[PDB]
């Protein structure tokens, strides 16, 4: 299919997309791409373009673990919407190389005994890391998640999610 | 498929199409193609052919932002219908390279708390940009969007959506 | 698929097909082919084979524009049915290069406030252009459309839709 | 698929099949194939193998019109069944080059105001062309079609549908 | 698909399969392959492996006519089952090149006015050719067909459906 | 598809799988693969990996005949389960080149008037062949099948289904 | 498809995925991929990336056997979830080359007369092999399994499922 072909040609340009909700399948597909790119060249940058309403914490956290694993820098681009885990992945890009396009929007969001244990542990990790990415205190991160705080590109720059607003490349 | 094969072959001629309703999926597809073409050659024009009834404001703005991001010029062509966000994208092409075909039509249109907040600002920012694109005052853009004003090629040239009618 | 494969190889001989109703997707696919062939070589003819019930007047008008835009001649061929916009596109072929196969049928047909406005404008322009293509007066085009006039290949030649009837090797 | 792959490969050998009922979609595919072959090389024969219960006169007649348009000879082969418009396309082959396999069978068949009118015109044309193909009077063709006359290969040869019964190539 | 790619690769070795019932679709696809192979090289054997419960007579006769039309020999191999028209196609292979594998099984079987006239004619012809293929009298073919007579590989060899039973091929 | 692409590439290594129930379809595909491999090179081994719960004796028998027809050795490997016709085909590999992986399991099992006749002779023939593959008396094959006797790798070696247990290739 | 060509291109880097439930079909495709890589080059590592809820004990043991069969080292990575047989296969990778990503979760679980017999036998092996992979006593494996003990990456390193936690560029 044309769509798939275009994505695969972009993969050759080391450009990847997170263009839908983050779930187990998409995480797998995306981890795979990051691994492939790192395997074929450890030193050339990867560009991750994000337009995603976000989703599952464990799914987003696996994409994150893989971004960390990859030896090359991962530039991130808030291309349309970066919400929930989409915001987290945006903020996880290599510092110096996190970008918002001028009309992007960044949203924060707060997403059986064993499941509850596992979720409590991963949720706390998400807040901790969101704090490291942005330089905000954890408490500010929790409160802002709770009230579904959202950000224009400028506001996002100011808050610490991105390093640059890019207009012309 | 034959139809995907033709669009692929056109990609090599730096021609792309918006031939359907703008939603997230289509916005993604179209941003991918622009990024690709910009990666392959930052200094050759891209041509964007438009036959589209429009769609969501946010999806159209991601396309717009990618259009601006590409270092290369983007020529736009109204091929059949450029309505709503399709009119916006047409009017967004590089000044001097916006074209209407002789029988093209141009159509203007207006398209939970936190959702409403974001919509209000993106809607306002779209009227703002449409005014810049066309040289009309913001007030004329709003009033004309409101009443679903539509345009023949000639009328579109005069109003400022395009720079040339090509025959 | 075999079908797609054959249409692709025919695209290499600069032959294209309109074999179904005219709607937006089909119009898009068809303007794309015309643009593709125009870009590959602006000097060589394109052949359009038509077997179509027609369909959307605005869709057909976009294809027509792309024909006019192409720097090369477009030869047109009526294969089975050329109805409404299919008849229009056949008649729009470069004069001298419009063909009917002998058992072709050519049919004329009469083809929300804002939709009606646009349709009135597009409709008048289609009649105007069809008049020009065939050499018939505008009122003859109108009345013939109203009464659903159809034409054999021979009748189509006489009326002005085409220049040739292929009754032997071409 | 394998099936489509063998048909494609057969196109390179200038062989085409009519292996099913004649309708608008089949007519399109077949006209397309003849046009392709004629464009590639106007001077080499095309071989059309027919195993068809016939179908639409309209669709059959489009294929026939393309056969005439084609400058190269078209050899026709009754492969199993040539009924109705399948009989028609067989008998439409280049004279001297219409063949029946030894066990082929050949079936004749007689198949809103303005639909009726288009139908009358094209039906008269079918009878007239079947008459020319076979050397039979149109009245014979009409009566024979009326009563669903059928033919062994030998009988079909006598009647004028084919020029040869072929057993070995 | 893997399966298709395998059959296609086999096609290059001039090897074809009848692995399902004989119907119109299958007949078209087999005739297509025979014709392709005969065009590619008129002087090299085609090998037809059969594992089929048979099916329509007229469909089977079209395959048969195409087998005869091809200038090259068709070698036939009873691979599992050869029943009804599958038996007939097996038996129609080039004399000296019909094979049974050791555990193959051969099964005989007997399969609107104008439709009836046509069926009567091809049924008779099918028996006539089965008699010619095997060397058996027409009345033996008819009666054996009636009672659904079946054969081991050894019994099929003696009856005349094949010319060889092969266990191990050579190199 | 990925799956098919790996099975294809494995075919170039001369490796085939029986990883589902043995029925006519799978028998056809497997015969096809053996026939192809023998045609490309009649002197190189073929390796057949088995993870199958068995099925039709007919189908199994056609595969067996093709294994024997192929001039090259066929190594068999019981990869997970070899049950019923799967056990049969495992035991049918070239003697000296039948293998169990360490955790494989081998299960014995026993699976219109004219249909009953045929079934009786192939069942009897299958027991006979199983007795010859294994070196067990025919009555013990019959008895053990009747009671669904199953085997660890070590017990299958002892009984005669395989010649070796492989741990590292 | 995009995904499939990605998984295939990764195969060229000798990297495999177990990203779903373990069953017979999946076990087959995974053993196939291992045998392929082993055949291509018997002396380069294979990397197995695991995000799996586990599944059938039989299917898992076929995968395990094939990894033991392959003459090359098999490195293993817990990418998201490794539960039941997923944990087993992770723990089965070449010692020195078992990895967890920091937010991975490792879960233990307790996994017709004839099927009961067979099952009893595989279950005992599974525990036994799990004990040697981890260096943990059999009683402990058994008790942990039947209370559904789960582990973070760090707890998994302590217990013996992995040798490394990847907290920086690998």
Curated annotation (Swiss-Prot), chain B:
GO terms for biological process: protein quality control for misfolded or incompletely synthesized proteins. Its EC number is 3.4.21.92. GO terms for cellular component: cytosol; endopeptidase Clp complex; plasma membrane. It catalyses: Hydrolysis of proteins to small peptides in the presence of ATP and magnesium. alpha-casein is the usual test substrate. In the absence of ATP, only oligopeptides shorter than five residues are hydrolyzed (such as succinyl-Leu-Tyr-|-NHMec, and Leu-Tyr-Leu-|-Tyr-Trp, in which cleavage of the -Tyr-|-Leu- and -Tyr-|-Trp bonds also occurs). Keywords: Cytoplasm, Hydrolase, Protease, Serine protease. One of its GO terms (molecular function) is ATPase binding. InterPro entries: ClpP (IPR001907), ClpP/crotonase-like_dom_sf (IPR029045), ClpP/TepA (IPR023562), ClpP_His_AS (IPR033135). Transmembrane segments: none annotated. It is found in: Cytoplasm. The active site is at residues 84, 109. Gene3D superfamilies: 2-enoyl-CoA Hydratase, Chain A, domain 1 (3.90.226.10). It is an enzyme of class 3 (hydrolase). Cleaves peptides in various proteins in a process that requires ATP hydrolysis. Has a chymotrypsin-like activity. Plays a major role in the degradation of misfolded proteins. Degrades anti-sigma-D factor (rsdA) when present in a complex with ClpP2 and ClpX. Does not seem to act on anti-sigma-L factor (rslA). PANTHER family: ATP-DEPENDENT CLP PROTEASE PROTEOLYTIC SUBUNIT (PTHR10381:SF70). Belongs to the peptidase S14 family. Fourteen ClpP subunits assemble into 2 heptameric rings which stack back to back to give a disk-like structure with a central cavity, resembling the structure of eukaryotic proteasomes. Forms a complex with ClpP2 and ClpX. This is ATP-dependent Clp protease proteolytic subunit 1. It comes from Mycobacterium tuberculosis (strain ATCC 25618 / H37Rv). The lineage of its organism: Bacteria, Bacillati, Actinomycetota, Actinomycetes, Mycobacteriales.
């Amino acid at each position: 299919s044309l769509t798939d072909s275009v994505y695969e040609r972009l993969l050759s340009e080391r450009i990847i997309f997170l263009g839908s909700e983050v779930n187990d399948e998409i995480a797998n597909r995306l981890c795979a791409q990051i691994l492939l790119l790192a395997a074929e060249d450890a030193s050339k940058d990867i560009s991750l373009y994000i337009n995603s309403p976000g989703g599952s914490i464990s799914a987003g956290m696996a994409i994150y673990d893989t971004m960390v694993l990859a030896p090359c820098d991962i530039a991130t681009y808030a291309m349309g919407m970066a919400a929930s885990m989409g915001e987290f992945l945006l903020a996880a890009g290599t510092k110096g190389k996190r970008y918002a396009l001028p009309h992007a929007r960044i949203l924060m969001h707060q997403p059986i005994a064993i499941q509850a244990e596992q979720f409590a542990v991963i949720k706390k990790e998400m807040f901790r890391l969101n704090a490291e990415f942005t330089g905000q205190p954890i408490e500010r991160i929790e409160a802002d998640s709770d009230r579904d705080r959202w950000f224009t590109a400028a506001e996002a720059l100011e808050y610490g999610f991105v390093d640059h607003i890019i207009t012309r490349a």
